[PDB]
Every structure is written in structure tokens, then in C-alpha cells.
Design a protein around this ligand. Structure first.
Ligand SMILES: COc1cccc(CN)c1
Ligand SMILES: [Ca+2]
Length: 223
């Protein structure tokens, strides 16, 4: 997260870190056994880390649970990043509490102008590289489909939305990938892509989660 703020330990209780020897992506806990992330975060040997603030220090609220399976969306295209969503099942159910909690799926799609919370352990620099140890947060509005399409000609599908600031300075970045965009207590987006970070007229692009609720529910019900 570039130009954000320190969230505060365990203030974003649905935020997970995906770890394969190191943090490589964010995710969102959607029930005791399932995490939603980006399909571009797919790899084998994933351990889901819940209750994290400082990802380099065991602070006492963590649960570390290995993934038993990953399910990338059947229509995910890695070139265009269309359908950039993946489900991860935990080998055992997380113990839910005030600091490890699921986030609700949307019942409706959020509109342009809606204020949301984007969070993660990604790069905090727009030019350099600096990775934080503690969770960073950014309040950001959803941008209109037209401004999103104008920012990225030929690249925005019906399964994507832009959020952030056309002036730059405040954005998600590398390592925030797969993490949440939450608006009014619903998971509306997944950190998906962009051109660099916090650059003028190049806002973050997010997977439009409301399009996938049926798939998520069906998949969970049979797996
Ligand atoms: C350039 O790599 C990125 C990864 C995740 C999110 C974004 C959006 N600035 C960019
Ligand atoms: Ca920790």
C-alpha cells in the first residue's frame, strides 16, 4: 500500500497473509474454512496465516493453517487477468474470534463513489522498494467504469473495477495482490493489477467480486 496508514494490529480481522516460506499475497477469510484471493496468486505449498499484524514476528493472535486445496476460477486468463479470483480451502477450520473473523460476500455490486478499505503488506513506495512488516490500510473510492476504461484503454472487462485516485500518490502495490477491498462490511474487490503503483492516471484495478458470488457459494458447497 502506497500512501496509506498503519491499520493497527488485528483491526482488519478478515485479512490473511499467504505464505510459502515468505509472504507473497493477501487474501480474505470468507468463512472458517475458506479464503478468497487472486488467481494470479496461485501456487502450491500455501500456508494461510490469520490474525497477523507484524508478519515477521509471532505476536500471539496468529493461526497458521495449511491449504488443502486451491481452486482457480475456470475462466481465469493470466494474460488479460480476466476472472482474477481463486478459492483456498484450509486443512482445518480457523477458530473465529474478534481478531480472526470472516468478511461477508456482497449481495449487490458497489457503485462508483463508494468508499472502501484496501489493505495489505505490499510495497509502500511508488518508485523504490520498501516492504512493511505491519498491515497497511488505504481508504479509497470506487471509480466510474468510464474513467477506469479511459485510464486503461482496451483492458478493463466487466469483471474489473478501478479504485483509488487519478492524481496518484495513494494505491495498492506488489504484495497487496489477492487482498481485500471492503466497502460497508462486504468484500467487493480483490487486489488484481495496475500499471506500477500510485502513478498519475493509473489507479489500481480490482476483481469485481459481486460477479462471482454464485460461483463462490456453489464451489464451497461441493468442496
Ligand atoms: C504493479 O503491481 C501491482 C500489484 C498489485 C496492485 C497494483 C495496483 N497499483 C499493482
Ligand atoms: Ca505475526
Amino acid at each position: 500500500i502506497v500512501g496509506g496508514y498503519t491499520c493497527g494490529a488485528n483491526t482488519v480481522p478478515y485479512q490473511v497473509s499467504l505464505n510459502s516460506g515468505y509472504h507473497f499475497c493477501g487474501g480474505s477469510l470468507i468463512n472458517s474454512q475458506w479464503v478468497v484471493s487472486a488467481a494470479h496468486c496461485y501456487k502450491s505449498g500455501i500456508q494461510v496465516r490469520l490474525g497477523e499484524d507484524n508478519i515477521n514476528v509471532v505476536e500471539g493472535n496468529e493461526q497458521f493453517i495449511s491449504a488443502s486445496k486451491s481452486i482457480v476460477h475456470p475462466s481465469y486468463n493470466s494474460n488479460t487477468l480476466n476472472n482474477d479470483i481463486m478459492l483456498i480451502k484450509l486443512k482445518s477450520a480457523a477458530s473465529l474470534n474478534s481478531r480472526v473473523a470472516s468478511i461477508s460476500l456482497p449481495t449487490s455490486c458497489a457503485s462508483a463513489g463508494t468508499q472502501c478499505l484496501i489493505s495489505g503488506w505490499g510495497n509502500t513506495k511508488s518508485s523504490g522498494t520498501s516492504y512493511p512488516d505491519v498491515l497497511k490500510c488505504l481508504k479509497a473510492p470506487i471509480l466510474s467504469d468510464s474513467s477506469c476504461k479511459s485510464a486503461y484503454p482496451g483492458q478493463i472487462t466487466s469483471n474489473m473495477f478501478c479504485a483509488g485516485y487519478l492524481e496518484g500518490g495513494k494505491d495498492s502495490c506488489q504484495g497487496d495482490s489477492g487482498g481485500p477491498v471492503v466497502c460497508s462490511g462486504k468484500l467487493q474487490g480483490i487486489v488484481s493489477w495496475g500499471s506500477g503503483c500510485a502513478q498519475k492516471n493509473k489507479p489500481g484495478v480490482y476483481t469485481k467480486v459481486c460477479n462471482y458470488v454464485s460461483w463462490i457459494k456453489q464451489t464451497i458447497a461441493s468442496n
